[PDB]
Each structure stands twice: as structure tokens, then as C-alpha cells.
Amino acid sequence: EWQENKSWNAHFTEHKSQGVVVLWNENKQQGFTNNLKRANQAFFPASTFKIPNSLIALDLGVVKDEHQVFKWDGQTRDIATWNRDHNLITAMKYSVVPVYQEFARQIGEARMSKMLHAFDYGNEDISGNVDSFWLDGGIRISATEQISFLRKLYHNKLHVSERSQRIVKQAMLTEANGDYIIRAKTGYSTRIEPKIGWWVGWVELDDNVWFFAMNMDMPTSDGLGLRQAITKEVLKQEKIIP
Amino acid sequence: EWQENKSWNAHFTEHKSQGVVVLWNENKQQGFTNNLKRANQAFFPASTFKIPNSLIALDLGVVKDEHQVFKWDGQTRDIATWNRDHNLITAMKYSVVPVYQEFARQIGEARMSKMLHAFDYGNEDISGNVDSFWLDGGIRISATEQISFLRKLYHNKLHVSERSQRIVKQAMLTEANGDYIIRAKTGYSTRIEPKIGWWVGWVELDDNVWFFAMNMDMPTSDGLGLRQAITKEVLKQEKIIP
Numbered sequence A, B: 001e002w003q004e005n006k007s008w009n010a011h012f013t014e015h016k017s018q019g020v021v022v023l024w025n026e027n028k029q030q031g032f033t034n035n036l037k038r039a040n041q042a043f044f045p046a047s048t049f050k051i052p053n054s055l056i057a058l059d060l061g062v063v064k065d066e067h068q069v070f071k072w073d074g075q076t077r078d079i080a081t082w083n084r085d086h087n088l089i090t091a092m093k094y095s096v097v098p099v100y101q102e103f104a105r106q107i108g109e110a111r112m113s114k115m116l117h118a119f120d121y122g123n124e125d126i127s128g129n130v131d132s133f134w135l136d137g138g139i140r141i142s143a144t145e146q147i148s149f150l151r152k153l154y155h156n157k158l159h160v161s162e163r164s165q166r167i168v169k170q171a172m173l174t175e176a177n178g179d180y181i182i183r184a185k186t187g188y189s190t191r192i193e194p195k196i197g198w199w200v201g202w203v204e205l206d207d208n209v210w211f212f213a214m215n216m217d218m219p220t221s222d223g224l225g226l227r228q229a230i231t232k233e234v235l236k237q238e239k240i241i242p
């Protein structure tokens, strides 16, 4: 059901990188990874948590829709794109933590915890501050657990409205052309070792869907592009994209 | 409110073609075109009619969701991509007329006419075969009328459910990257002169949306790629995309 293919390690070593790519063929219900152990090791979700956080905020009415404007609070942060107004689409695109921190406060701990349990999301532990726990609190998730969660989102099976799931899938849109559509979310965990990068989501084809979840050691910001590049080398090797 | 910019004609004449591009800046509520008259000239919608047809089929339950499979009827036809099973996503991508003819028959004349009147769509005239009138019946629509219809869809303001509009807009997804998202639909009017190609939809930016509608003289199928290419040259010239 899970098969290992150490061939992919070549795309990590070409950049003296280390990590795991997990793929799931939805038609055949078969998984593939370069590293079975690391595929099941849990890490901080970091900004991949904006997927569940969006769903809860939308379902509770904290976010009205994908056009609602969340005004910059006027405090300059050292990510330039955060110091402006955002909606859900742009907050996800630029991983605008302060917008999502405000969502999480309005959601509150009790509603956050029960939604994550209903989602079966990671260790479902929101130990810590409600507005930081996906960064430095108690929550952890593995690449295979990301796949399982994303599969439920793809099929509208999570315990939120169908509308909530459709809107988050819209906001996950990353790339599209006549060959594939990628809906996904990046993440970068920095507060505690090991510093890792995430890319999770799926590739939609005419006749199949390939779910994916990858994380990699990320000692500095200078390699963040490798999350997508290495994932794409594996997708190409497996003939999922040209 | 409307500006004529005949400088865009250079892109048409380069390919010894003729046509019109119409653009609408949603934030500024301002419109632009190379040919005010042809902007208002009504043509067969041809396969751009798959936009309202999709909406109607979804809102009436004729199409349950974007995953329902409409089986190929076994009759081999000249466009290979049509000779295969489809859902709403792939039927729109490959403009699979026979699938949408089935929709139209199930919708029926009465409900089709009522819907297009509720939509204020073109000249609202479905005279002819209930399953061919957008290609050889009485219906006609201009570029400016396409924009007016598309703006209502974008805003979920048409008189069908939000869900129906969300699903159609998902099916219209054509291109997406880090700079823009294009949701659009092509068309080729080939049954009754004059032979014309259509491309209509919108470009989503971080902080604005630019609606577009273009048609061009299209004597042979070999020029069809000009529809998107001339549109993008205009989009590039107006600095809307890089």
C-alpha cells in the first residue's frame, strides 16, 4: 500500500538536501515515498496549518468569504507582503501569519481543539497559545497524515460545510495550465530544531489526482525554492507532469 | 467610461487578422477596447455558451457535481478528445459539445429560456434546436454583453445558487501562476457565417480583476491559438500581466 523508491533521494542529494516526498495515487489507492520512516515522522505544520485554520474560520463565520478584507494592523513586520491589507486568497498566497493569528484568537481554544479532533488532524494537540501553537505549541503532523487530511478535503468529507471546503480549495490554487492543476500550501518551521520546509497538496489531472506531501531540512531561507523544485523533479520522474 | 485604444490593432494586423478585445477594470469601473463598434456586435456564442449552460445544468440537478461522469455515447466524431468519458471539468476544457447537448435536452426549452432571461444573456433568444441553438439558432451576444454576464458570475449575483456559480468558476480555470489567475472559455462559431473565434473570462490579480472578451475573424482552425496570444499581448501592453 506504501512502496518505497529510494531513487528519488537523487533529487535531494543533487542539492545536498535531505527530506521526504510522499505521493498517493488516488485512482489506484497506492502510496509512494523515498523514505518510509521520515514519511511517518511528525513535524510542526507551520504555515500548512493555514489550510485547517481557514476551514474553521470560514465554517464559524469568522471569515465571511474570500473577498473580506483583513486590514493591516499598522505594525511593520520584516516580510514586506504582510504589511498591507489581505483577503483569504492573498493571505494564503503570502502566508500572512498575523492575519491567521487573528483568526485563531476569534476561533478560540475550545472551538479550535474540537474542530481539529473532528478533522483527525495530526496529534490534534493545541497545547500552547491559541494563536501560535502551530508554530511553537504542541501540534505536530507527518507527511502521511497530511495526505490523509488533504484527501478528505478533496472529497468534501471534512466536518465543515461543503462551501467552506470549496473556498479553501480555491485559495490553495497555486499553478494551472493545460496539463495539470496544483492546489497546495507551503510551510517553513523555524522556532525549534529541526528547521524544515513543507509543501503539501495535490496535482489534478484530467483522469486522476496525485496527492503529495514533502518536507525537507531547511537550515536557511536560501533553499526554500527547493520545496517545489524537488517535488517537481519527482512528479516528472513519475510521469505525472511533463 | 469607455476608452478606444486602436493601438491594439497592431497585434491583429501582425497576424493579418481582424477583431476586437474588450477589457474591463473592475476596481476603476472602466472599460477599454480597440473597436467600440465591434465590441457591441453580437455573434453566435458558440462554446462560450458552456458557461451559462453549465450554470443551468448544475442549478437544476441535471449535473450533480463536477465529478459526475457523462459516458461517451460510442459514436466516433472528428475531435478525438470527444470520444471518451467526461465530467464537467474535462467537458469544458475540451469543449465537448455532445455532452452539453445532452444537458440542454434535459434542461428543456422552457427552463432554458427562463434562465437566459433571468441572466439577461445576450438577446435571450433560444430559437431552434434546444441542443444546437448556441451554434446555429437564434441566440446572439456581443463582447460587452459577455463582460456584463461574466461580472455577475464573478460576484455570485446570477439567479442560481452560489454553489453552482462556484463550480462553474472552478471549471473555467485555465491558467494560474504567481502573477495571475485566468478563468475563461473559448468558442469557435463554425456552422453559420461569419466564422469567428471567442475567448472570454477574467484575470484575477492580487488587488484587482480584469474582465475580458475578445472575438476575431477565424476562417480556418489553424488560427485558434491567436485568440489567447493576441489577448495576452494586449494584457502585456496594458501592464496587467508581466
Ligand SMILES: CC(C)(O/N=C(\C(=O)N[C@H](C(=O)O)[C@@H]1NC(C(=O)O)=C(C[n+]2ccccc2)CS1)c1csc(N)n1)C(=O)O
Residues within 6 Å of the ligand: B076, B077, B078, B097, B098, B101, B135, B136, B190, B191
Ligand atoms: C456530423 C460530424 C461530421 O460532425 N459532427 C459534429 C461537428 O463537429 N460538426 C461541425 C460543427 O458543428 O461545426 C460541422 N457541423 C455543421 C452543421 O451542423 O451545420 C456541418 C454541416 N452539417 C449539417 C448536418 C449534419 C452534419 C453537418 C458540417 S460539420 C458535431 C457537433 S455536435 C455533435 N453532436 N456532432 C461527425 O463528426 O460525424
Ligand SMILES: [Cl-]
Residues within 6 Å of the ligand: B131, B132
Ligand atoms: Cl448537432
Ligand SMILES: [Cl-]
Residues within 6 Å of the ligand: A169, A170, A173, B169, B170, B173
Ligand atoms: Cl479554482
Ligand SMILES: [Cl-]
Residues within 6 Å of the ligand: B047, B095, B186, B187, B188
Ligand atoms: Cl473553441
